[PDB]
C-alpha cells in the first residue's frame, strides 16, 4: 500500500501544481492577452474602415488564410514543407515527440502513417534517450574512476563500473550540459533567426523538453546562409539538447520519487 | 566495442535510417496535397486582391497583424478566451505532460521564465507519474492473474506478486486499452467538435503520444453545452490516454531493446 500511497500523493501534488501554475500564468499574462486582442481588434477596425471592407468578407478571407497557414504557407518566406529536407525536420519533431505543428499532415493516408510511425519511432527514441542516459552514467563513472586511478598513480609516482555517480551529481552534470547546449544553440540562433537571446533560450527549453509549442521554430524561413551546414547544426543541437533535457527530466523524476518516499516515511511515523 | 556502446550506435543508425525513410514517404504522401493547398491559397489571395482592389503589400501587412493576433490566441471562429484560469489550466496540462499544442503560448518575458522554471519540475513530475502509472498497471495486471488463479483453484478444489506478466502481455493490454480510450475519446469529440471520427482518432494519437501538433485541439472553441462536464471529461480522457500511450512507448522501447540485443547476439555469433 506504500506504492499506491505514493501514486496518490504524486497525483495530488501534480494537481495542486497544475492549479498553482494555472493561477500564476493567468495572473502573469491575462493583461498581455487582453492587450493583444484589443490591438488586433483595433487593427481589424482600421483595415475595414480604410479600405471599405465588410466584416463578413474579412472573416472569410481570414478563414482562407487560416486554412492556408494550416497547409504550411506563411507571410514571410517560409521554406516549402514536405520536401525531403522539410519532411526530415517534421519526422524529427514527430519521432522525438516535439511536434511543433509547423508541418502537419492533411491527407488521410498521411495521418494513418503518422499514427503507425509515431507508435514505432517515438518508442524507439524513448529507448534512445534511456540508452543515452545510461551511456552518460557509464561515461561519468569511467571519468571518475580514471581520475581516481590517475590520482593513485600520481601519489605513488568484467562488468567493472564499481564507482557510480550519485543522482545529485548526475543532475548537476546534466543541468550544466543542458545550459551549455542551450547557450550555444541560442548563440547560433540569435544572429541567424533574429530572435532575442531570451527568446532563443525559451525556444531551446521548449524544443529540448519535447514540449514544442511551435510559436518559435528554428529553421523554417528560407534563404539561409550556409543552409546545408545550418540545418545539420540545428538538427545536432536539437538532438543533444532533447537528449540532455529528457535525461535531466528522468534524473529529477528519480529525485522527486525519493522525495515522495521521504514524505511518505515522515507521515508513516506520525 | 562495448555491448552497450554497440547497442547505442546500432539504435542511433536505425533511428537515422528510420527518419530518412519516414521523411521520404511523408514527402511522397503530402507534397502533392501541400502544393494543391498552396495553389488554392494563391488563387484565393489573387481573387481577394483583384476583387476588393487591395495592394499585395497592404494585404501582407494585414496578414502579419493577423499572425501576431493568432500568436496571442485570436482565431477566426469564436475560440475561448486565452490565459483565463480554465484556459491556463489546459495550457499548464499541455506543458507538464509535454504535449504542448501551442493554442496558448507565453509572450511576456516573465511568463516564459516561469514556463522554464515551472516546466522543469512539472515535466519531471509528470514523467515520474507516467512511470508510476506503468508500474501500478503491472501490479494491477499481476493481481488480476493471481486472483484468476485463486478463483480457478478454488473452483477446481470445490507483497507477493513476484510473478509479473510478460512484456508481450503488457504490450497487448496497453495497446488494447489505448485503442479503447482513443475510441471513447473520439466518440466524445466527434459530435461536440464536429471533427471526423478519423480526425478525432488522429488527434487522440497526437495528444496521447505527447506529440501535440496543435492543428486539432479539443476544448478551444467557446460556448459548449455543459462546459464544466465536457472540460473535465476531456481532461480525464487526455490524462488516461497520455498515460496509456506513454506507458505503451516504454513497453515498446523495452521490446526494441530486446530486439537490438537479439540483433547484436546475431552479429556476435557470426
Ligand atoms: C487604429 O486606429 C486609429 C486609426 O487611424 C489609429 O489612431 C490607431 O493608432 C490605429 N492602430 C493601429 C495599431 O494601427
Ligand atoms: C463600400 O462598398 C460597398 C459595396 O460596393 C458600397 O456599396 C459602398 O458605397 C462603399 N462605401 C464607400 C465607397 O464609402
Ligand atoms: C478564384 O480564382 C480562380 C482563378 O482564376 C477562379 O477560377 C475562381 O473563379 C475564383 N473564385 C472566385 C470566387 O472568384
Ligand atoms: C483602386 O482603384 C482606384 C480607381 O480610382 C485606383 O486609382 C487605385 O490605384 C486602386 N488601388 C488602390 C490600392 O487604391
Ligand atoms: K513530448
Ligand atoms: K516525452
Ligand atoms: K510535444
Ligand atoms: K507540440
Ligand atoms: K504544437
Residue numbers in the entry:
A (entry chain A): 14 to 170, 185 to 297
B (entry chain B): 13 to 170, 186 to 297
Give verbatim excerpts from the published study on this entry.
In response to inflammatory or infectious neuronal cues, THIK1 mediated efflux of potassium ions from the microglial cytoplasm modulates activation of the NLRP3 inflammasome and pharmacologic or genetic disruption of THIK1 activity decreases inflammasome-mediated production of the proinflammatory cytokine IL-1β. The overall structure of the THIK1 channel follows the canonical K2P architecture, featuring a dimeric channel assembly with a domain-swapped cap domain at the extracellular face of the channel, positioned above a central pore formed by the TM2 and TM4 helices.
To facilitate cryo-EM structure determination and anesthetic photolabeling studies, we purified a C-terminally truncated version of THIK1 (KCNK13), bearing residues 1 to 309 of the THIK1 protein sequence. Using cryo-EM, we solved a 3.2 Å structure of this THIK1EM channel construct. Our 3.2 Å THIK1 structure is in a putative closed conformation, due to the presence of an occlusive pore gate constituted by a pair of inward-facing TM4 tyrosine residues positioned directly below the potassium selectivity filter. Inwardly opposed Tyr273 sidechains arise from the pore-lining TM4 helixes and meet within the pore to form a central occlusive constriction ~6 Å below the THIK1 selectivity filter. In the presumed closed conformation we observe in the THIK1 structure, the Y-gate tyrosine residues limit the size of the ion conduction pathway to a diameter of less than 2 Å, precluding passage of potassium ions to the selectivity filter and dividing the inner pore into a large lower vestibule and a much smaller hydrophilic chamber directly below the selectivity filter. Consistent with this notion, we observe EM density between the S4 selectivity filter Thr110 and Thr237 residues and the Y-gate in our cryo-EM map of THIK1. This “S5” site density is equivalently spaced and linearly aligned with the S1 to S4 potassium ion binding sites, and we therefore modeled this density as a potassium ion. A five-residue sequence, from Gly189 to Ser193, crosses the distal TM2 helix and adopts an inward-facing orientation previously unobserved in other K2P structures. In the THIK1 cryo-EM density map, we find a curved lipid-like density buried within the core of the THIK1 protein, directly behind the selectivity filter.
